[PDB]
Amino acid sequence: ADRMSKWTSKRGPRSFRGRKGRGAKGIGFLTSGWRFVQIKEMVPEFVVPDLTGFKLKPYVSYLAPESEETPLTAAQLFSEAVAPAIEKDGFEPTQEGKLFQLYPRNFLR
Amino acid sequence: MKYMVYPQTFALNADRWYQYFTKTVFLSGLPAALRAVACDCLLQEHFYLRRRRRVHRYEESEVISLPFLDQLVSTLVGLLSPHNPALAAAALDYRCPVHFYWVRGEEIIPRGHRRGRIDDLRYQIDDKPNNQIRISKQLAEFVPLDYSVPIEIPTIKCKPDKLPLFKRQYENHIFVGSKTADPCCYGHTQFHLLPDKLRRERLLRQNCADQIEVVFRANAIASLFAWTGAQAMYQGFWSEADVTRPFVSQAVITDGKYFSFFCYQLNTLALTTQADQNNPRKNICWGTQSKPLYETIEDNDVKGFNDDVLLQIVHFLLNRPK
Amino acid sequence: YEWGVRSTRKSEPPPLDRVYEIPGLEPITFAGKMHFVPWLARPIFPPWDRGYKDPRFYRSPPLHEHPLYKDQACYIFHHRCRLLEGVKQALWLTKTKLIEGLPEKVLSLVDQDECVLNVISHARLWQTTEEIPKRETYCPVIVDNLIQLCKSQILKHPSLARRICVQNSTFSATWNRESLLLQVRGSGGARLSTKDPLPTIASREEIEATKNHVLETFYPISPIIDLHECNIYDVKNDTGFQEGYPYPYPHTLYLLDKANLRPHRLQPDQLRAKMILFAFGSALAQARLLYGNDAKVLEQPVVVQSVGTDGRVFHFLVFQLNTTDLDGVKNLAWVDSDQLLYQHFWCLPVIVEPVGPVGFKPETFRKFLALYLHGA
Amino acid sequence: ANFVSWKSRTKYTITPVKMRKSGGRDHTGRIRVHGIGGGHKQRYRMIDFLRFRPEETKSGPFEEKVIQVRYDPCRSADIALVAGGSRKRWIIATENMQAGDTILNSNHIGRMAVAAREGDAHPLGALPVGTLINNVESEPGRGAQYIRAAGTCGVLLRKVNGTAIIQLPSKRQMQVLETCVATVGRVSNVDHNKRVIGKAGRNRWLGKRPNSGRWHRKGGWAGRKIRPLPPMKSYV
Amino acid sequence: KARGNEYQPSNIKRKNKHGWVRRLSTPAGVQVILRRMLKGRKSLSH
């Protein structure tokens, strides 16, 4: 009966162990007489692109030049994408019916 | 503590493990009204039988596969009675458990207060066939006693605990279809059926496409071995007192469309190391590939029906006991 | 006396804040925040309604809104409907005669025991691993073993191959009395089907002479008393098969009654009543499928049998429907109650008495075989 | 202090409702009545004390019929389920009430007296003078409350205007309205007071803990009080 | 008899008696947790 041990799935009895668990993020739900159904929609599908022809490497060479850091912000992005704004003389007001919404984290990473 | 062997398993390449735990020898091959009756029985549960409650995909193998198989078995037993008089006085048990217990090899305790002692690991098969037939007399021998068949047996160069086969302690039961105080102790054919878990569609969805037939083979081997061992123990034979005569058996498996048959020939019962160094005999288990009984059914009419499966079923059910 | 108890019922909500009774300002409630607050007033949220439909969390409409909600409450009948009076209620609901004796043809068709004794002993002791089995285990096993023993005689009678014993089979039939509407439902056991129909036992002379006697009333008890009163029932009849299906005509309703406990049983009288009702419903469904839905007198009467339940006690019922217009002539049924094969069985040896059944009689097996034959 | 009353059943069900014993505990958890607890499990059956109560789309009288006479563990007197019309309802059983008997349930106050059987029930306005009754109600349509134990039975004294004085078994006069319903005869389960317990086993099975061990000194209330009959209490 | 074993181990009873939920259900446990935090204990509840 220690007070420092982190309460996990290796402390409580059968019922507690069965109900508790690790933060693995469940997939589907449970219904009927112990019949867990897996929902393909909730399953995390990893979109892996094709690496053929990728001339990049995970390590950079030492012969590259040194440059200062430029924190990219909204002002810099607006300045970079200023060609149509000046040519006029692309913006969504409500993104409720949008798939990849911004403020409400509807996507994953 | 003993390994809880399950005939209807889902492991990969479990056939070799089962053959090693049983010491068998697999061999590919074998040692108008009926067609209409089978088509009618199919179409019945497939369209005619009005289901009050809507059946789903999970409630399919338990509402359309079991009743149809039971009706087919009943019709076959009823139609083959004149040609086969041994089936008239036969006892058919609908859904009856089959248990058997045996020992195989040794195992030293790896860690604990029992370290350094030999503990003969045990096994147990708790098969639950859908329906089987029983006859007082015994089947013929087909294969004679003691056979060569130089094909060797799988070795399995690792601990048996690696494969999803865990240990559990409970009442050791050796049951065939009835108790020892019953004349209808022998049989011939056996019927089984895998649940929604071991569906060929599920295996195709994943990458275990080569295990489709392996699962059926392992299930049939386990069922036949449990049946033969229990029926031999019912006669008094066991490890020390080896069986004097063979206990041939037959079993048919399927999943809803594909059918395949498997034979057996129990030769010995001593699976322990105390009587295996001088036991050149070994068991045999024939089998065939899975063939489709019918392509598809349109509303209320079969498409590509198969007659070879029905002919093989008739040949298996007509075998008279000598 | 009002049953409910205030403490058990839903607790009455607190009184509304006195700020809402002022017409009409904006009461500063905690609606702006997303959590309970002690101070400030309490708002009045509107009735939220989910847009999409979730099968796991779907609420059905009330009884005042349905596709076929009828005003005439029809009383349905199922296997669970445990009658009160007994066989008289079933006779009144069916309008048929009760004859205490099987017909002559069935008894004459009779003109062995070791196999029956062995099967009984097996189903009662050896059919399971543990000792002292349960009714739920050996009742269907006994029924199946008896069916197999009766069917094994195909070598003698080659006409016994044109039949099959299904399992999950249901039926439906609706009819009027004086003058409410009634309804029945399928069973929950076995069912034997035949290709050709059964022969007519009683001739038209008996059907015409039955007009003399009348039904047996039971004032003040009503024929419903125990029947399930259920609205939204759909009067459209239905059977357990579809058009163009081999073995359409029935033969004997091999319904069973599991239940390991006495209170969960159906009793002899009520079980016979349920069997008679099921036979009448099946006969009416067959007649409606063959002829039309109009109320008239049938020319070719049908026959539907049914066997009792319980491994020990056994009952027999041979129905014979000949008229569909209830509201005239009537039907007649042959009953054979309290037949019971073998009195008691001793699983373990008491200390005197061997391990086996006692009080066995072969007449039960003979009657079972005769009922199975009938047409062959 | 979790204490939920098992009395949760709005619909009058016929099946024995699972009775959860109390043992003298209130909603808090403290004992307020000693001598309750430790007994055999029982199942309460919803009794229909209100004798007169027509079913759906009904109003006029309706006969009844007895089916069986069972025992009730929640009280001393036995019960007997009676079916009437298209429904059933548990009610208290009367003396000499065998299975299959007919029970009449009416409410029309006839001009003269009505010879009531040993089971039927009629309003006090149609009962002869001097007749044993039981299950008397307090107000019109209230429900039976008085005279409901085993063997208890009150005799009818007299009727004054639209009222009727009922002599309760305790030799107490009670004025009840004439339009109220009440059964006749005495309750079943005769010779109950003479039922010798025999041993403390049955007493504990019934659910009655032993008395306390404190030697309570008898004060003034222990003496015999030869009090007279109390005044007649009316409900009008 | 041997009364030295006054403690019976059980996680359900422990979590139900000295539980965070049971503590916050009343101001008693709230004040207890506040005092334990002011003191600086590493473990506030069980």
Place this chain on the structure above:
RNA sequence: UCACACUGACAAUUAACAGCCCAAUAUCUACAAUCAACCAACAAGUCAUUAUUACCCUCACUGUCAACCCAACACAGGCAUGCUCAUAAGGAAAGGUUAAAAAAAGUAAAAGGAACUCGGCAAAUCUUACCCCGCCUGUUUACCAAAAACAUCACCUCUAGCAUCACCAGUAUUAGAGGCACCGCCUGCCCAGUGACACAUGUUUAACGGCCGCGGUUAACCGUGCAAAGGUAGCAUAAUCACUUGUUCCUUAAAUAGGGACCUGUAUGAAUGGCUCCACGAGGGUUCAGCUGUCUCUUACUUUUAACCAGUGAAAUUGACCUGCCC
């Protein structure tokens, strides 16, 4: 570093074993378990659905180790379920040498078998009679008192005319508060005093409690005073202040021990319950046939213990001690 389970790194355990649970509208659940089939009951009881609406996406998650828990510990202490009631599993009372004294667990006895002791108290021969208390069985001070007390079914006293949260989902054969404790004889007087019931100067005792003194004739009996009544039946030196080892018979040859009849019991006594009574009490005593080293009068033997060799290795206690006898 008893002796070498102590440190840093290495990875098992893979679930199919049990949980992780059932979308609603309304309506059906009375014929126990005890092989449940005869009998046989009382403690009245442990397992079940209906038509419709909508749904045919399916095998993820938690523990799978061990010599293990709770008592400061590697503690002769406590722990339920299925299997065998000595086994296919589960362990080493002896670290070596000797038999110091004494103590504990056992073995044998020439003679008596309770004559030792307050007491038939560990010992096994093993079962019989007479008394006290209690009706039993059980509970009682966990951890010195386990009873003759607390309780128990029988009896009896008082209070309540009654629905929602215990009593109670009940109704003067019921519920609540109480004295004693079955069965047989039975339970005689009283409100002077307190309390309660009264509203009628009263009732209540199976409420708290009390039921005579003097002189004359061991005594019928006579006179007198007080008071509401002056101890009724029964029983007896008792579980009963002192007198009291009472009178007397038996029980031992030897009896303040035990039983059988008497009360100057001036302080026994009838629900503060009195006296008998077929069963029973680890409750308290006596005793007829048999005994066991308790004794007469003890010894010999085995084990732990005891003495030396090797090590871990301390408590309470200590003012310092160079620490004797007689008057």
Place this chain on the structure above:
RNA sequence: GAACAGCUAAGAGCACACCCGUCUAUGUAGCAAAAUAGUGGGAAGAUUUAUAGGUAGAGGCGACAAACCUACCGAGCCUGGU
């Protein structure tokens, strides 16, 4: 929910497992802040017990030991008044 072998035949008797602890002898820093072997009462019921919830000090419970309520309860422990 679970437990109660077997023998003679009713809150019957002996007796396994189990609940309780009348005596003997060891110890009181003992193995143990209540232990060890035998002699013992119950062991089909008013019995024992696995799980969870409820009754807490100006109190709860009590088949009354004015006993018990986390090893010391004629009335606990800790915080501040100490």
Place this chain on the structure above:
RNA sequence: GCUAAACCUAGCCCCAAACCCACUCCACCUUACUACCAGCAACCUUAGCCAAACCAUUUACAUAAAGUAUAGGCGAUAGAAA
């Protein structure tokens, strides 16, 4: 000479001034350290030890005025303002 004592930096207390902290990722009110579904939650004279030999009245938790007027079984003590 074996066992054993010697080292100030960490840090703290008393004051001045000034009003301090609370989102790398995720969980955090159910069995906190748990992603995922249909109910009521707080607004209550503090008491007491102690002193008066006990205690039942009573007793506290800038400077001067002044411990003055007053209260106090008129006493232990309390106690301001202009």
